[PDB]
Design a binder for this molecule. Structure first.
Ligand SMILES: Nc1ncnc2c1ncn2[C@@H]1O[C@H](COP(=O)(O)OP(=O)(O)O)[C@@H](O)[C@H]1O
Ligand SMILES: CCOc1ccc2nc(C)sc2c1
Ligand SMILES: [Cl-]
Ligand SMILES: [Cl-]
Ligand SMILES: [Cl-]
Ligand SMILES: [Mg+2]
Ligand SMILES: [Mg+2]
Length: 265
């Protein structure tokens, strides 16, 4: 169906390990969108064809205001192209580096949006497993949208693919290569809440080896300015035992979230 000839390409929107993402306009409709380009040579080398198929299959059937749309895909002799909804206000990552830290109202509102999206995903037993600021995009009204479903799967699951970069958002069961389920996304939600309020993730360190250590032992502390409500929520999410982490309804109904969020469940 779609082919490269159908689009006018514009400015680079960002880069990933495999993804190179561009603004684009479809020629006869003038529809503005984002084109995610992947190189087949690099995909075959890393052996991650199965991850891309899951990305397309999982993300194209989800429909939620806080999840980025995937409309389709095409490919030629050297490249694969994913046709995505364009997110005009950029990444939460860029926003955090602009402001250093988020206030309590901004943080709680982002957490509500994230928990709504994740609740919808978990109702289909879909787990994202790669929730982090560079994969959270912003729509035209500043609303958060989850993107980048390359690591997503159906629970329960193991891991058959090498962990590439940062350990910072992963739970103990995941980094220890053990068995895992939906509760992994709840751990990540805790890491994000901390990073939004403080400016850095709670297990950050100078080496892989030591980050692994801080995560497996759940070794984190709070700066003085983090309030008692925020501390309570984060402490509940960052539990070593997955079955002790709260359900998402409990997150959405936590007194600190209800007091500070400007959006409903
Ligand atoms: N739909 C989009 N709208 C705007 N920017 C995007 C969009 N998709 C990706 N980006 C930008 O490109 C980067 C890489 O996209 P991503 O899909 O996460 O690739 P990878 O799978 O390589 O991580 C993002 O972190 C973001 O900066
Ligand atoms: C949903 C389609 O996924 C695809 C399609 C083509 C393709 N070519 C590769 C080398 S990896 C791959 C994945
Ligand atoms: Cl498996
Ligand atoms: Cl895997
Ligand atoms: Cl729930
Ligand atoms: Mg990404
Ligand atoms: Mg990816």
């Amino acid at each position: 169906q779609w082919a490269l000839e159908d689009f006018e390409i514009g400015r680079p929107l960002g880069k990933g390990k495999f993804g190179n993402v561009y603004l684009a306009r479809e020629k006869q409709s003038k529809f503005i969108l984002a084109l995610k380009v992947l190189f087949k040579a690099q995909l075959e080398k890393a052996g991650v064809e199965h991850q891309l198929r899951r990305e397309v299959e999982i993300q194209s059937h989800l429909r939620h205001p806080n999840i980025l749309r995937l409309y389709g895909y095409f490919h030629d002799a050297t490249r694969v192209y994913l046709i995505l909804e364009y997110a005009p206000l950029g990444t939460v990552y860029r926003e955090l580096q602009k402001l250093s830290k988020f206030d309590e109202q901004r943080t709680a509102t982002y957490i509500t949006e994230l928990a709504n999206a994740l609740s919808y995903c978990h109702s289909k037993r879909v787990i994202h497993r790669d929730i982090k600021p560079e994969n959270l995009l912003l729509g035209s009204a500043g609303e958060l949208k989850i993107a980048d479903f390359g690591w997503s799967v159906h629970a329960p699951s193991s891991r058959r693919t090498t962990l590439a970069g940062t350990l910072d958002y992963l739970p103990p069961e995941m980094i220890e290569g053990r068995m895992h389920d939906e509760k992994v996304d709840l751990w990540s939600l805790g890491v994000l809440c901390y990073e939004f309020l403080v400016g850095k993730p709670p297990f950050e360190a100078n080496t892989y080896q030591e980050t692994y250590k801080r995560i497996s032992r759940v070794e984190f502390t709070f700066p003085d300015f983090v309030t008692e409500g925020a501390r309570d929520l984060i402490s509940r999410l960052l539990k070593h035992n997955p079955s002790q982490r709260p359900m998402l309804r409990e997150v959405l109904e936590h007194p600190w979230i209800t007091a500070n969020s400007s959006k409903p469940s």
